[PDB]
């Protein structure tokens, strides 16, 4: 009945009683595990549950106000086929959507999320204004603050609001003529689209891409992000003087803008959220991934390492220094940053907090474990249970 | 219908059609994934399936010989409740078991495995002779060779054969009087059990544990492995001259001996197998895990690193150097070893070969990806499907419980 979860490092044991209530169903079956894979009555049933979650959170479950709310939403659905949330409910939902994200190692700060109600957004122009205000509040001159901006929900009888970009700030990727790619190869598709929509492209490796904001039943409009608002950090190493001369850099604000927020059967196709970076995400993944910037060999060559064979561990050595550079650079530039050790350690605390709160915590082991030095972090030795709880952040198909 | 598996580095795509033939159920349900957790009529069915696999492997499927074999096993089971495997079947079975091990990144070598038939073993003393011969063959003076020794199967009318030790070679763990442990903390239980059974221990950090072998319905007997049979490697660093002075070492032969072998419904509780080490297992797991030798901090301090803050990545630096020392030490000592980069690269080839052969390959992502530099290896960016295929190696409860 209750999955036994053990920590092998310490030997501590707990039981996940929260998974037995997973609203949705995962891809795994008793026949095979696919955990490593990246990817009106029904509405009323999801709505009732959410409202119940809300009233339970303010210790008012079963009250008259609780019953009224349940009845009021059931009435809106019968009359309009859908319903609207109250400000306090959206705030509550958005927070839970983060708390329930299984692949996020930074959930310890879930409760201090700042939600911005942008359900009154009239068009692409206003949408752009909202995104700019979000970036300003979030960046905060380098002292990053977690936040999310919720745009008008999906509704029958019109299209939805959508931010074509995968993140508010992304570097362009130009298909160089010879097969190669200058800039970020992961952004090749979105870059070519920005160009198709009348954008004058650049020729650099770190060109900040414009935003392709789509309004309901309207073609995507192009908007350029004011340079003074997109904070960036020049990369340098504390002892490798030549590093700075590599011209590497990275933006300060990580902000996913292509995921769908779901709250009580309601879907918000546009709701950009952001926090702060964990060193590995930049130094190891974005900079060292073979299908990304792939700078590992270049740096190793500059470190004068024996790259003639794998046994020397030049890749491991190079990656470490690259990560050191990112941490050193971000701290020097007074920009919020967190190393994988501190991050994973805080997540272990989040697990303890959650076990006492709900009796479990949905977590995807594969994503919680950092890309480098896995077994060196406390989460590696921690067994985890993965399941889908609502509210939640979901992946959605590209608008094109 | 069939699970779509994708590689995010290259962009390639395949569909696991073999998972549909998974013989047994795992712990995951559509409600929640548990892949991160470490842990008569049916007999005939499993046996028939195995015989079909064997005859299909030698291109004799549906032949008189095949049909006769199936009849034999049915007759034997109906008469005794079990059956005798033919020599060639045991060989084929053991190989498949390795082939089907989801948590093994070294399966590219599944076909090259020496098999010792010890089904004639009648005592612990004899069980010891078999083991020593295995170690000698497998060790091969440094040029390690994959091998397995299959002891008498589980049957009605008597107890099972067991090897209480989790590996043929492991270091003792002595609980000091201050909460600390001298030696391998992971071996405190097995160490104490050997002592309780009459063995007077040493007091070092690297004491090879005596073998606790058990014959059917008999108490375990102590057996000391001859030092000349246990090949060890002294650890040193190519540049860090002070590393050698740490007096650290490790054995050459990794040999699991607490697992059960399952072939066509038959269970072999004692079937020790071995291969060779992948550097990270020793450098990262055995020496750096906080619950093992935990030398990470001492090494960092010796490296004169700044252990004050975590942002300096002192842990990461020390781990890399400890791994380099293991690779350097084994290469110098002429003892077979492979780094995580070469091992993972070879496993990517295994996936391809298996995609052509059986149309898929069960793999536990969490175990395949090395304990360090995960994203730097080719397997990290590869989707995998985990499931149970027989023949297979299975975990089993400790004989003293
Ligand atoms: C406090 C700073 C935060 C840190 C350090 C952090 C870190 C991470 C990391 C490391 C991942 C995995 C990314 C990858 O390897 O691809 C992730 C995923 C995720 N995080 Fe957080 N996060 C933070 C804040 C937030 C906030 C404010 C939200 C939402 C309100 C959030 C929502 C998510 C979601 C939905 C995912 C899945 C994204 C995906 O798989 O594409 N995170 N986060
Ligand atoms: C040829 C050299 C070999 C290498 C480098 C290799 C490497 C590995 C590694 C790294 C693990 C995971 C250990 C851990 O993380 O705790 C593993 C597990 C395993 N290997 Fe291989 N292996 C080899 C040979 C073999 C052979 C010869 C067999 C069987 C005939 C085998 C059967 C298995 C099984 C069943 C497991 C799972 C063990 C467990 O769950 O505790 N391996 N191997
Ligand atoms: O390292 C990080 N921090 C992050 C914050 C968000 Cl919202 C998403 C991904 C992240 O990866
Ligand atoms: O690194 C390794 N090599 C191994 C060989 C066997 Cl048989 C088991 C575990 C191993 O871990
Ligand atoms: Zn699963």
PDB file of C-alpha atoms and ligand atoms in Angstrom, chain B residues 94 98 101 103-106 109 113 146-148 256 259 273-278 281 285 338 367 393 395, ligand 2:
ATOM      1  CA  UNK B  94      24.125 -17.867 -17.347  1.00  0.00           C
ATOM      2  CA  UNK B  98      24.127 -11.282 -17.520  1.00  0.00           C
ATOM      3  CA  UNK B 101      20.980  -7.396 -16.037  1.00  0.00           C
ATOM      4  CA  UNK B 103      21.940  -2.293 -13.873  1.00  0.00           C
ATOM      5  CA  UNK B 104      25.093  -3.467 -15.701  1.00  0.00           C
ATOM      6  CA  UNK B 105      26.897  -0.931 -17.928  1.00  0.00           C
ATOM      7  CA  UNK B 106      29.415  -3.597 -18.956  1.00  0.00           C
ATOM      8  CA  UNK B 109      31.009  -8.503 -22.923  1.00  0.00           C
ATOM      9  CA  UNK B 113      31.956 -15.404 -20.044  1.00  0.00           C
ATOM     10  CA  UNK B 146      34.699 -12.759 -16.845  1.00  0.00           C
ATOM     11  CA  UNK B 147      33.555 -15.895 -15.019  1.00  0.00           C
ATOM     12  CA  UNK B 148      30.732 -17.506 -13.017  1.00  0.00           C
ATOM     13  CA  UNK B 256      29.173 -10.632  -6.485  1.00  0.00           C
ATOM     14  CA  UNK B 259      22.739 -13.065  -5.721  1.00  0.00           C
ATOM     15  CA  UNK B 273      30.124 -14.211 -10.881  1.00  0.00           C
ATOM     16  CA  UNK B 274      32.836 -11.680 -11.682  1.00  0.00           C
ATOM     17  CA  UNK B 275      34.169  -9.276 -14.277  1.00  0.00           C
ATOM     18  CA  UNK B 276      36.481  -6.319 -13.761  1.00  0.00           C
ATOM     19  CA  UNK B 277      36.256  -2.854 -12.204  1.00  0.00           C
ATOM     20  CA  UNK B 278      35.092   0.438 -13.651  1.00  0.00           C
ATOM     21  CA  UNK B 281      33.032   2.199  -8.484  1.00  0.00           C
ATOM     22  CA  UNK B 285      31.641   4.836  -4.370  1.00  0.00           C
ATOM     23  CA  UNK B 338      38.098   0.846 -17.456  1.00  0.00           C
ATOM     24  CA  UNK B 367      22.516   2.726 -12.406  1.00  0.00           C
ATOM     25  CA  UNK B 393      20.229 -12.492 -11.565  1.00  0.00           C
ATOM     26  CA  UNK B 395      18.501 -10.305  -5.066  1.00  0.00           C
TER      27      UNK B 395
HETATM   28  C1  LIG C   2      33.173  -7.159 -17.488  1.00  0.00           C
HETATM   29  C2  LIG C   2      33.256  -6.272 -16.426  1.00  0.00           C
HETATM   30  C3  LIG C   2      32.132  -5.741 -15.767  1.00  0.00           C
HETATM   31  C4  LIG C   2      31.933  -4.424 -15.453  1.00  0.00           C
HETATM   32  C5  LIG C   2      32.869  -3.258 -15.703  1.00  0.00           C
HETATM   33  C6  LIG C   2      30.640  -4.339 -14.838  1.00  0.00           C
HETATM   34  C7  LIG C   2      30.162  -3.216 -14.201  1.00  0.00           C
HETATM   35  C8  LIG C   2      29.010  -3.099 -13.416  1.00  0.00           C
HETATM   36  C9  LIG C   2      28.632  -1.974 -12.620  1.00  0.00           C
HETATM   37  C10 LIG C   2      29.304  -0.632 -12.595  1.00  0.00           C
HETATM   38  C11 LIG C   2      27.533  -2.321 -11.926  1.00  0.00           C
HETATM   39  C12 LIG C   2      26.830  -1.477 -10.884  1.00  0.00           C
HETATM   40  C13 LIG C   2      27.437  -1.615  -9.495  1.00  0.00           C
HETATM   41  C14 LIG C   2      26.897  -0.590  -8.515  1.00  0.00           C
HETATM   42  O1  LIG C   2      26.646   0.569  -8.925  1.00  0.00           O
HETATM   43  O2  LIG C   2      26.725  -0.935  -7.325  1.00  0.00           O
HETATM   44  C15 LIG C   2      27.223  -3.663 -12.324  1.00  0.00           C
HETATM   45  C16 LIG C   2      26.155  -4.434 -11.884  1.00  0.00           C
HETATM   46  C17 LIG C   2      25.823  -5.748 -12.231  1.00  0.00           C
HETATM   47  N1  LIG C   2      26.518  -6.536 -13.080  1.00  0.00           N
HETATM   48 FE1  LIG C   2      28.041  -5.894 -14.313  1.00  0.00          FE
HETATM   49  N2  LIG C   2      30.021  -5.552 -14.774  1.00  0.00           N
HETATM   50  C18 LIG C   2      30.905  -6.442 -15.308  1.00  0.00           C
HETATM   51  C19 LIG C   2      30.673  -7.808 -15.392  1.00  0.00           C
HETATM   52  C20 LIG C   2      29.582  -8.506 -15.001  1.00  0.00           C
HETATM   53  C21 LIG C   2      29.450  -9.927 -15.204  1.00  0.00           C
HETATM   54  C22 LIG C   2      30.594 -10.839 -15.652  1.00  0.00           C
HETATM   55  C23 LIG C   2      28.171 -10.235 -14.778  1.00  0.00           C
HETATM   56  C24 LIG C   2      27.470 -11.457 -14.708  1.00  0.00           C
HETATM   57  C25 LIG C   2      27.792 -12.673 -15.294  1.00  0.00           C
HETATM   58  C26 LIG C   2      27.599  -8.970 -14.303  1.00  0.00           C
HETATM   59  C27 LIG C   2      26.350  -8.870 -13.709  1.00  0.00           C
HETATM   60  C28 LIG C   2      25.856  -7.734 -13.133  1.00  0.00           C
HETATM   61  C29 LIG C   2      24.718  -7.695 -12.339  1.00  0.00           C
HETATM   62  C30 LIG C   2      23.688  -8.752 -12.134  1.00  0.00           C
HETATM   63  C31 LIG C   2      24.712  -6.475 -11.769  1.00  0.00           C
HETATM   64  C32 LIG C   2      23.744  -5.930 -10.771  1.00  0.00           C
HETATM   65  C33 LIG C   2      24.385  -6.039  -9.399  1.00  0.00           C
HETATM   66  C34 LIG C   2      23.523  -5.444  -8.310  1.00  0.00           C
HETATM   67  O3  LIG C   2      22.353  -5.120  -8.598  1.00  0.00           O
HETATM   68  O4  LIG C   2      24.014  -5.296  -7.171  1.00  0.00           O
HETATM   69  N3  LIG C   2      28.479  -7.938 -14.440  1.00  0.00           N
HETATM   70  N4  LIG C   2      28.136  -4.117 -13.222  1.00  0.00           N
END
